[PDB]
């Protein structure tokens, strides 16, 4: 008993579902947590050894920080801020190394498949850059003319989207409720007819259209939210939803804990 969920579409990177019997505040809080509060792995520090390319060092550092990394077992990693090491260790970071040389007469593309994990993952499931395309090459990090070299090391720490958007695993989150505007939460702008000028949402097929003669239902509340979560690739989209719920529950539990302890 409680909030009820029915999922329409399931994919590797998208889940489209219905969230019924739930308050609007709860659904919006879940959406916000999925956007912002889910921990993820991403490259945080870059030590540049050699860069004879045409791009600036911090340009490449930023591009590397935007590379999505596997974060299935990110809960087994610790934040660098609350680890006993000096700068970075194996309990709180993953070390990668990008070493590329332009030994070909044509331009050599430095992808994210060339990122090599150096630190011992200790059997975790973190660190690997996410590969999505069929060619197998990851994100196009840089390009090299013949004789140009790029040697650098990356330290990846866990983080959340609040500190920096590079840690956000959730991409775009579709969120809609009351497709027929039965709650009258919007006043439709129009020129001649509001119904003709506003295209019907795809979710209108899942609710009974209003009878156009019935009185306004002032007691009705908002529920049955149609939500589509997309995944960047760091964690599966179902894990995105589950970890969002978990993080929100953790926040409320921490509020209870602070209240009791004070």
């Amino acid at each position: 008993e409680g909030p009820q969920v029915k999922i329409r579409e399931a994919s590797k990177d998208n889940v489209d579902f219905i969230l019924s019997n739930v308050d609007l505040a709860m659904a919006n809080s879940l959406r916000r947590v999925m956007i912002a509060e889910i921990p993820t792995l991403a490259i945080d520090s870059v030590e540049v050894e050699t860069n004879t390319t045409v791009l600036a060092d911090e340009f490449i550092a930023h591009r590397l920080g935007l590379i999505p990394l596997q974060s299935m077992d990110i809960e087994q990693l610790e934040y660098s801020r609350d680890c006993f090491c000096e700068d970075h260790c194996d309990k709180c970071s993953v070390v990668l190394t990008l070493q590329a040389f332009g030994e070909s007469e044509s331009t050599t593309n430095v992808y994210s498949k060339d990122l090599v994990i150096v630190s011992n993952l200790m059997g975790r499931n973190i660190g690997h850059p996410i590969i999505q395309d069929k060619e197998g090459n990851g994100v196009l990090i840089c390009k090299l003319r013949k004789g140009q070299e790029l040697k650098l090391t990356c330290v990846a720490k866990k983080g959340i989207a609040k500190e920096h958007a590079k840690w956000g695993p959730a991409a775009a989150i579709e969120f809609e409720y009351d497709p027929w505007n039965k709650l009258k939460h919007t006043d439709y702008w129009y020129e001649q007819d509001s119904a003709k000028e506003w295209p019907q949402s795809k979710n209108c097929e899942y609710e009974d259209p209003p009878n156009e003669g019935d009185p306004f239902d002032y007691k009705a509340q908002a529920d049955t939210f149609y939500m589509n979560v997309e995944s960047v690739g760091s964690i599966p989209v179902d894990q995105v939803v589950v970890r969002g719920i978990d993080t929100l529950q953790k926040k409320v539990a921490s509020i209870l804990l602070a209240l009791t302890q004070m």
């Binding site: 004879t52 045409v54 935007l66 060619e135 003319r145 004789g147 956000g168 991409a171």
Partner: protein, 69 residues
């Protein structure tokens, strides 16, 4: 300069869809809209991320390297 890794607005990774986009434009003679739809860029934020990119890095690569090994 070079293709951005992620769409600015939503954050979808688009840095791996540049060479595929160029291959679709050239080899298959597809127009830009169909090629964008093929790669999975449905929101116009991602579509403007990939459609309007200018690959200046090629120009930068034309000049001889300053430090050649």
């Amino acid at each position: 300069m070079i293709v951005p890794v992620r769409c600015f607005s939503c954050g979808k990774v688009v840095g791996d869809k540049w060479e595929s986009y160029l291959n679709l434009l050239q080899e298959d003679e597809l127009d830009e809209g169909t090629a964008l739809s093929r790669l999975g860029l449905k929101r116009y934020c991602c579509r403007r991320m990939i459609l309007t990119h200018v690959d200046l890095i090629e120009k930068f690569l034309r000049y001889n390297p300053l430090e050649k090994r």
